[PDB]
Amino acid sequence: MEVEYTLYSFEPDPETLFDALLPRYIATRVYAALLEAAASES
Amino acid sequence: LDPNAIITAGALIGGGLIMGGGAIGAGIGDGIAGNALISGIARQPEAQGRLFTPFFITVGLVEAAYFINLAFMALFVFATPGLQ
Secondary structure, eight states: OOOOOOOOOOSSOHHHHHHHHHHHHHHHHHHHHHHHHHHHHO | OOHHHHHHHHHHHHHHHHHHHHHHHHHHHHHHHHHHHHHHHHHOGGGHHHHHHHHHHHHHHHHHHHHHHHHHHHHHHHSOTTOO
């Protein structure tokens, strides 16, 4: 993924949350692609 | 060996001890409460108004003791109990 350019309280730490969120972000984008492809197919 | 000399020596030692202890307590407590306040403000500027209410409470509990020390300390040196 390319990078495009109050303070939130991240727990346990920002890095662990980022690492957990990235795979779920990729899965979400895959799911969105699947939904949009199904709509295009219909 | 005058007795009042010993009286004054003991009173001054005790007063110095109380003043030092009160200084330690006040300094540490004020520093810790200030650390809490600074971190809280850093996380969210809006809270600056709110945090003073609890923060100022803590100082009141702390400084009181310190200002009590001085008071009781003033008792020993200026009017030493048991002095003749």
